[PDB]
Amino acid sequence: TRKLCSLDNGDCDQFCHEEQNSVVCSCARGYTLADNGKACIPTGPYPCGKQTLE
Amino acid sequence: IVGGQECKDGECPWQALLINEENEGFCGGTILSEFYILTAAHCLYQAKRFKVRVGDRNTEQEEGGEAVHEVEVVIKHNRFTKETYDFDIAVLRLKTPITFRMNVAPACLPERDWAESTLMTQKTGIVSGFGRTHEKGRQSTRLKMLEVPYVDRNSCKLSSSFIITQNMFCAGYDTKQEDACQGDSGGPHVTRFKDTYFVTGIVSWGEGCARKGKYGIYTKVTAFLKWIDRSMK
Numbered sequence: 083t084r085k086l087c088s089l090d091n092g093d094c095d096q097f098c099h100e101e102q103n104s105v106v107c108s109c110a111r112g113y114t115l116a117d118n119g120k121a122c123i124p125t126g127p128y129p130c131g132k133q134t135l136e
Numbered sequence: 137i138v139g140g141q142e143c144k145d146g147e148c149p150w151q152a153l154l155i156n157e158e159n160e161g162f163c164g165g166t167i168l169s170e171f172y173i174l175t176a177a178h179c180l181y182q183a184k185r186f187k188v189r190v191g192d193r194n195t196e197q198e199e200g201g202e203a204v205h206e207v208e209v210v211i212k213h214n215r216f217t218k219e220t221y222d223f224d225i226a227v228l229r230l231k232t233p234i235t236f237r238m239n240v241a242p243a244c245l246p247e248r249d250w251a252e253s254t255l256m257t258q259k260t261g262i263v264s265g266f267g268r269t270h271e272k273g274r275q276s277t278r279l280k281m282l283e284v285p286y287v288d289r290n291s292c293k294l295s296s297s298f299i300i301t302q303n304m305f306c307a308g309y310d311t312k313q314e315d316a317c318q319g320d321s322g323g324p325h326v327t328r329f330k331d332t333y334f335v336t337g338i339v340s341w342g343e344g345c346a347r348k349g350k351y352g353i354y355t356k357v358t359a360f361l362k363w364i365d366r367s368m369k
């Protein structure tokens with residue numbers, strides 16, 4: 083039965099790890115973990131992994 | 137790329153093109169950061185001297201967004217072997233930093249365990265490049281991309297006349313006439329996760345292109361994340 087990171091990536095935007103018996107989210111370089119500890123917010127322009135629109 | 141679609145404006149911004157002395161593309165790369173390109177070790181034997189072009193989508197036309205960079209340092213994996221193409225990976229440090237803009241942006245490097253459990257277990261990834269559009273053809277003048285199913289590791293070994301090492305994985309179609317091809321070599325295999333694209337493979341080799349019962353063979357980038365990190369410092 084899917085638990086923690088195996089259940090919808092633990093609700094993380096990006097990286098999910100399981101520590102103690104709990105989800106810990108984190109983000110790629112050039113992103114900051116949001117106040118909710120789940121979303122990843124780009125720190126500057128042209129963050130990695132985004133298709134360009136400007 | 138055999139089959140697939142053109143990269144439209146802004147769609148494949150991490151694509152790089154290695155160009156020889158004649159200004160012709162012979163391999164791809166993936167932009168990792170303003171100074172670094174990921175490519176295949178085997179590509180380094182296809183030209184004596186080369187440069188890297190970014191921002192290009194049509195080699196016939198100048199869209200004003202293209203830029204060429206010279207290579208300062210070539211870091212080739214010391215275990216690369218021509219016989220099997222094992223360890224088919226190199227990193228290039230550029231003399232000058234890439235200017236990110238429309239059609240020029242890095243792909244994200246994922247963490248190893250999450251990539252293996254979560255990215256490589258997705259249904260598909262996306263390969264792109266300026267390679268041949270059929271097995272016996274000329275290089276594309278248009279940047280193309282193609283969604284490729286991840287292929288079961290057992291099926292892949294069974295399909296192959298050559299050894300599939302743990303530094304390799306298989307993607308594509310059993311019979312559908314879509315694959316990467318020669319000249320896509322060295323280029324990006326990325327996997328989308330929630331609208332963010334992570335680099336997952338390097339186009340490496342195949343038995344022809346788009347052949348029935350055969351798949352595209354990619355360098356498994358997760359096997360080299362530490363090595364890549366070291367190489368970039």
Ligand SMILES: CN1CCc2nc(C(=O)Nc3ccccc3CNC(=O)c3ccc(Cl)s3)sc2C1
Binds near residue numbers: 298315319
């Ligand atoms: C160990 N060897 C390394 C090189 C090698 N080349 C072999 C071969 O048949 N080459 C060959 C022959 C005709 C046309 C194209 C190719 C190469 N195709 C590609 O590069 C790719 C297709 C899909 C992706 Cl992913 S890349 S067979 C072989 C085995």
Ligand SMILES: [Ca+2]
Binds near residue numbers: 195197199
């Ligand atoms: Ca052009």
Ligand SMILES: [Ca+2]
Binds near residue numbers: 308309310311351
């Ligand atoms: Ca096939």
